[PDB]
Amino acid sequence: SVKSEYAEAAAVGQEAVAVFNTMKAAFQNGDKEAVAQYLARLASLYTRHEELLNRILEKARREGNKEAVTLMNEFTATFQTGKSIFNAMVAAFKNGDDDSFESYLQALEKVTAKGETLADQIAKAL
C-alpha cells in the first residue's frame, strides 16, 4: 500500500538522520576522510528518499486523496529546502569553508526538526 511505501520512505529518512549525526561528529573531530564518505552516503540516501516521496505523492494524486496530496506537496517543498542546504554544505566542504559548513549543518538540522510534525501527519493521512 501507499502507507507501507511511506513507512519504507520514513525508514530511509531515519537512515539519513543516523548517518548525518555520525557525519557531524566526524566534522567536529576533523576526520575529513570520513566526512567525505558520509556526504556521499547522504547524497545517495537523499536521492532515494526524494524518489520514494515523489512516487507516494503521485499515488496519492491518482487515488484522489486530497488531504494527503496537500500535506505531501507541503512536505516535498520542505524536502527541497533541505536538499538545497545539503548541497550547499557539500560545496562548503569541497571549498574548505568550515564556517559555512557549520552554518549549513545547523540550518539543515532546524529545517529537518521543523518538518517532523508534518511527516507524522502524512503517515496518518495516507
What single letter denotes the amino acid at residue 72?
M
| DSSP, res 30 | T
The upper half-sphere exposure of residue 74, i.e. CA atoms within 13 Å in the direction of its Cβ, equals: 14
Residue showing cell 548525518: 20
What's the number of CA atoms in the CB half-sphere (13 Å) around residue 73? Answer: 7
Radius of gyration of the chain (CA): 16
Q: Grid coordinates representing 91?
A: 560545496
- End-to-end Cα spacing for the chain: 9
Resolution of the PDB structure in angstroms: 1.6
Residues belonging to the chain:
126
Contacts for 21 with CB less than 8 Å, ≥ 6 apart: none
Structural domain boundaries in the chain: 1-126
On whether the CB atoms of residues 93 and 39 are closer than 8 A, the answer is: yes
Count CB neighbours of 82 within 10 A.
20
Phi, psi (degrees; rounded to nearest 5) at 45: -65, -45
d(Cα 26, Cα 94) in Å, to the nearest integer? 15
CA–CA separation, 26 and 48 (whole Å): 23
Please tell me the distance from the alpha carbon of residue 117 to that of residue 109, in angstroms, as a whole number.
Answer: 14
